[PDB]
DNA sequence: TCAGCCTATTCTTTTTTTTTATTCAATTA
DNA sequence: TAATTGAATAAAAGGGCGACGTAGGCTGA
């Protein structure tokens, strides 16, 4: 967590340093690793001083070629905030990945609001219990924010009641353009304090409910690539873990029985380029559920069980 | 629940208040739930005036991140009206909740419309007697409005019939779009008098008879999702309770394995992610039927038992 | 009961108003009962003028939001035709509520084709003796229409059957699509003269023979669903008691018990959800038949003995 | 011409078919 | 003297088994 108070040097004034705050660029990681075509069209920053803010951002955080052994250390330095389920820690090799896109499939009753509200108390746990010891936030868009589920699974982990009440924040995401106004604000709390998890269970559901296909046909598409350009900028900012429940379409293959999958879910191929690690969830018998990793040479294809019981997502 | 009679501040002219009204969004809650580019496509609106509506309405309603010890109270203000027999109410922890989506689905003669008529008398009850002291809004397309039942359950709770008849009102949608034609009625009446409940007793029955051509996103699915976000909108506009009713299909693929008669009710995944909770209907013996809850994030998957008696639901 | 001549105003063209009548829409309620896109799909129509109908269909008939009091005045304004038997009316609490689908399924020889003969006679009475005093319709797809049987009921009620033979009009179906076509001719007759009873006394006897099952079933069921939409709209325009005779299969599994003999009325769910007053017909001893009630919004699960005499239904 | 025709290459590896209701202490003497 | 049940059973295996079609679109036209 680093603000842009470092970026006040080399002839810069106090007026222009606020014009990076009001543009949405609240971190020093936002300045160097952004493409140049979005930074230059702001009214009131000239071309020579725009080349001044990129050259001071180059030497602090390096964009040059770094050793591949440092990348393997960048692969293993993940905190791996565990889901509470030890089978998934044997499936995803020790929990969720902080800073990589981790997508979970779901249609109905598969525990999607139950997995998000067990992880939302996990962010206070120490690193031996798996959690990252940090604040977090659950932004909901389907009107399914639960205090009772949040308060009960804290008793499973044995914490108090009032500390997790000061934990995960919530705002109702009304619109697809309201996904952006929280995102500039969610980086602004990242200036205020450290955060370790961000969860939205129905981010793609707003895409299902704003753009009446077709006629807009690209407007439903580029707003997904927009939203998947913002969150990876926060994922490259600190290394925050992302947890998104994505919905699934029932593909019509129902003649007869050969590879009959009501599948190939929504979001398109442009989330498929961004989802380096995908998961499939589905109903089993009773209330027990099953996870399988998809669309990932990073994680091996296997299956395990996570059981939504009265205590939480456990066994 | 606030109207646009207060937005007429800081240069907003009188033309854009009432043309926003008739076009479909009567409340400033709906303006925050309206998108950016959708406001531009109304004839009589420019792009510069489209900023002056959404930004100035953002001065009215706040959308910041609020901590988890405040929605615990925001859920606690829910009136959570009763269901007429406490075995369902203890299954539902008091009864159905306001500001959510609740669904009853079952085969036939199972009381999909009879659980409506007992909820239709609840809205004029006091808060000690479950009711939010308001009015309910009954919509049905099949023709299951039988107001002699509404005389009956008012005598179940003692109160007179005429004042109840001055209350809850009716509409019958003949078309899929005719639902959204009569949907504007909601807000319209809503701001004139506080309503406790909305009933659409045939959500997807009209959609069952107007498919796309072969199953596709058109009127069968997209206009269904256009419908449900407005049902989401009314849940977020006023917090008014609403019950929804989906018909049921059979399964022709499941040869005589574990259960020879499974159902999987219609609508696919678009209804399912808009679905907050469901309660499955199936008959027992005679007047005894059975409610089984489906897909609640806050309540377990338990089962209860009611009976359609002459006074209404009972035991 | 208002035709397209009540629509021919306001500079609306005379070339499209016959295209409605070519598409079966002979009255302004039907286009008000029709969704927007399908009328746009009609060839040779102006799209805006089609919308100009859709605001003037909204003007001519009440599609506006009303309160249950005037409904309860208008729902009391139903002719409520008696069924010839004294015991059957008090079972149904005053006979057959006009404007509704009342289904009568049973085995062979129970009286399904018998009662539909007697109902066509008792329409011609004045309303004091539970008559309707209107024309009535007979759609047969079995050939079991027998006008000699009507004259026996005519002598029972002191009415000259020669006068009753100038009314009820015969028709005969042969196909699935010859059936649904026969509504569109009949709709006109409903404009040009008052009716009370449109019987389809083997309405689902024909869909079983002309579609196999497990494949070509969805082509049956959707087309069965396309049938009832035209059928419910005939009830609501002209105020006509709609009587459907369903046949019945025998269910074949370990559900074989007594007094249910498990029958499972054919037509799945789409013939079930379109019930207002679903019946059931068992044979007792001899001519004493036993009419159990299913699936009705206002009636209890009772039964009433009735004997099919030499002169119609008797007691 | 489209509409009937033609069946272009594909492509990736693993999940769950019952029950007549006694034990006991009984839920009441 | 309470006495009927709130509770609980399983390794064998049935009076059971069957789906639309727009996707490469030649030739007839
Ligand atoms: N009090 C409770 N006790 C036990 N289990 C519970 C309780 N409340 C909820 N559950 C479980 O929560 C599960 C709900 O799964 P879930 O997939 O989160 O539903 P959902 O996500 O809210 N539906 P949706 O809004 O469409 O995402 C149920 O299957 C229950 O087993
Ligand atoms: N006076 C009454 N006494 C007892 N039961 C009644 C009485 N009136 C109606 N019922 C029952 O109420 C139920 C009404 O049917 P219901 O199941 O609500 O409609 P439904 O599920 O929508 N089927 P459908 O109306 O065709 O779509 C039936 O089970 C009737 O037996
Ligand atoms: N003149 C009569 N006197 C007495 N009973 C009669 C007379 N004519 C017919 N019936 C009875 O009417 C009943 C006809 O049964 P009904 O159920 O109407 O026919 P149905 O079953 O529909 N024929 P089907 O199409 O094969 O089902 C029989 O039980 C006859 O005994
Ligand atoms: Mg869930
Ligand atoms: Mg019902
Ligand atoms: Mg008969």
| Number of B–C residue contacts, CB under 8 Å | 106
Report CA dihedral (C84, C87, C91, C95) to the nearest 10 degrees: 20
Least Cα distance to B178 among C39, C138, C135 occurs for: C39
Q: How far is the CA of B261 from the C1' of D18 (A)?
A: 15
Q: In this structure, is the CB of residue B257 within 7 Å of any atom belonging to strand D?
A: yes
User: Do residue C222 and residue B210 have CB atoms under 8 angstroms apart?
Assistant: no
**Which of A146, A165, A167 lies closest to B297 in CB terms?**
A146
Contacts of B69 in chain A (CB under 8 A): 162, 165-166
Q: In this structure, is the CB of residue B255 within 7 Å of any atom belonging to strand E?
A: yes
Could you tell me if B39 and B62 are in contact, meaning their C-beta atoms sit under 8 angstroms apart?
no
Cα separation, C228 vs A219, in Å, equals 39
CB proximity list for B223: less than 8 A, separation 6 or greater: B176, B177, B180, B207
Atom of ligand 1 nearest to the CA of A110: 17
Q: In this structure, is the CB of residue C215 within 7 Å of any atom belonging to strand E?
A: yes
**Which of B32, B66, B297 lies closest to A113 in CB terms?**
B297
Report CA dihedral (B149, B152, B156, B157) to the nearest 10 degrees: 90
Which positions 270-309 on chain A have a beta carbon less than 7 angstroms from any atom of strand D? 284-285, 290, 292, 301-303
Question: Got the DSSP string for B148-174?
Answer: HHHHHHHHHS---SHHHHHS-EEE---
Q: What is the resolution of this structure in A?
A: 3.9
Structure tokens at B291: 């409610």
Stretch (H or E) spanning B208: helix B205-209
Stretch (H or E) spanning A116: helix A112-122
Alpha helices in chain C (DSSP H): 17-22, 28-32, 36-40, 47-60, 68-75, 86-91, 112-122, 147-156, 161-164, 176-192, 218-238, 270-273
Cα separation, A233 vs A242, in Å, equals 12
Stretch (H or E) spanning C280: strand C277-283
User: Do residue B68 and residue A176 have CB atoms under 8 angstroms apart?
Assistant: no
Least Cα distance to B208 among B105, B299, B58 occurs for: B105
Q: In this structure, is the CB of residue A254 within 7 Å of any atom belonging to strand E?
A: yes
Contacts of B249 in chain C (CB under 8 A): 269
φ and ψ at B248, to 5 degrees?
A: -135, 140
Query: What's CA B113's distance to the chain center, in Å?
Result: 14
* Distances A92 to A283, A294, B176 between C-alpha atoms, Å: 20, 11, 45
Q: In this structure, is the CB of residue C255 within 7 Å of any atom belonging to strand E?
A: no
3-state secondary structure at position B139:
strand
CB proximity list for B199: less than 8 A, separation 6 or greater: B116, B119, B120, B136, B137, B138, B139, B140, B242, B243
Cα separation, A59 vs A6, in Å, equals 12
Angle between helix A112-122 and helix A147-156 axes, rounded to 10 deg: 60
Query: What's CA C89's distance to the chain center, in Å?
Result: 18
Question: Which residues sit with Cβ closer than 5 angstroms to ligand 6, an ion?
Answer: C 112-113
Mutate to test the pocket of ligand 3, among C113, C116, C149 (most ligand atoms within 8 A of CB): C113
Q: In this structure, is the CB of residue C219 within 7 Å of any atom belonging to strand E?
A: yes
Mutate to test the pocket of ligand 2, among B114, B202, B307 (most ligand atoms within 8 A of CB): B114
Angle between helix C218-238 and helix C176-192 axes, rounded to 10 deg: 10
Could you tell me how many residues make up chain B?
315
User: Do residue C35 and residue B210 have CB atoms under 8 angstroms apart?
Assistant: yes
Sheet of C305-308, strand order:
C169-172, C135-140, C195-200, C241-244, C101-103, C277-283, C288-293, C305-308, C313-314
B254 known member of a binding site: no
Under an 8 Å CB criterion, which residues of B touch A? 32-38, 63-69, 71-72, 75, 99-100, 214-215, 217, 222, 225-226, 228-229, 232, 235-236, 253, 268-270, 272-276, 294-295, 297-298, 300-301
**Which of B66, B273, B295 lies closest to A202 in CB terms?**
B273
Mutate to test the pocket of ligand 1, among A107, A112, A283, A288 (most ligand atoms within 8 A of CB): A112
Cα separation, B209 vs B196, in Å, equals 30
Structure-determination technique:
cryo-EM
* Distances C171 to B143, C179, C202 between C-alpha atoms, Å: 28, 10, 12
Could you tell me if C85 and C306 are in contact, meaning their C-beta atoms sit under 8 angstroms apart?
yes
Could you tell me if A197 and A136 are in contact, meaning their C-beta atoms sit under 8 angstroms apart?
yes
User: Do residue C66 and residue B176 have CB atoms under 8 angstroms apart?
Assistant: no
């Amino acid at each position: 967590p680093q603000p842009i108070s470092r970026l006040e040097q080399c002839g810069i004034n106090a007026n222009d340093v606020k014009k990076l705050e009001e543009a949405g660029y609240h971190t020093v990681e936002a300045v160097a690793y952004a493409p140049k075509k979005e930074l230059i069209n702001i009214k009131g920053i000239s071309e020579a001083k725009a080349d001044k803010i990129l050259t001071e951002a180059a030497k602090l955080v390096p964009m040059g070629f770094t050793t591949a052994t440092e990348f393997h250390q960048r692969r293993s330095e993940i905190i791996q905030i565990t889901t509470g389920s030890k089978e998934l820690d044997k499936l995803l090799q020790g929990g969720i990945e902080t800073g990589s896109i981790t997508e979970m499939f779901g249609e109905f009753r598969t525990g999607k609001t139950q997995i998000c509200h067990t992880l939302a108390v996990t962010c206070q746990l120490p690193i031996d219990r798996g959690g990252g010891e940090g604040k977090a936030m659950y932004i909901d868009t389907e009107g399914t924010f639960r205090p009772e589920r949040l308060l009960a699974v804290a008793e499973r982990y044995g914490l108090s009641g009032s500390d997790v009440l000061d934990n995960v924040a919530y705002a109702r995401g009304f619109n697809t353009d309201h996904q952006t106004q929280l995102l500039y604000q969610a980086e602004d709390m990242m200036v205020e304090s450290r955060y370790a998890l961000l969860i939205v269970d129905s981010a793609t559901a707003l895409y299902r409910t704003d753009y009446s296909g077709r006629g807009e046909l690209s407007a439903r598409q580029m707003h997904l690539a927009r939203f998947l350009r913002m969150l990876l900028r926060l994922a490259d900012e600190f290394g925050v873990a992302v947890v998104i429940t994505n919905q699934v379409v029932a593909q019509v293959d129902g003649a007869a029985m050969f590879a009959a999958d009501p599948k190939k879910p929504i979001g398109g191929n442009i989330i498929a380029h961004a989802s380096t690690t995908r998961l499939y969830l589905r109903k089993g018998r009773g209330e027990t559920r099953i996870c399988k990793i998809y669309d990932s040479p990073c994680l091996p294809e296997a299956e395990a069980m996570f059981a939504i019981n009265a205590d939480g997502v456990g066994d």
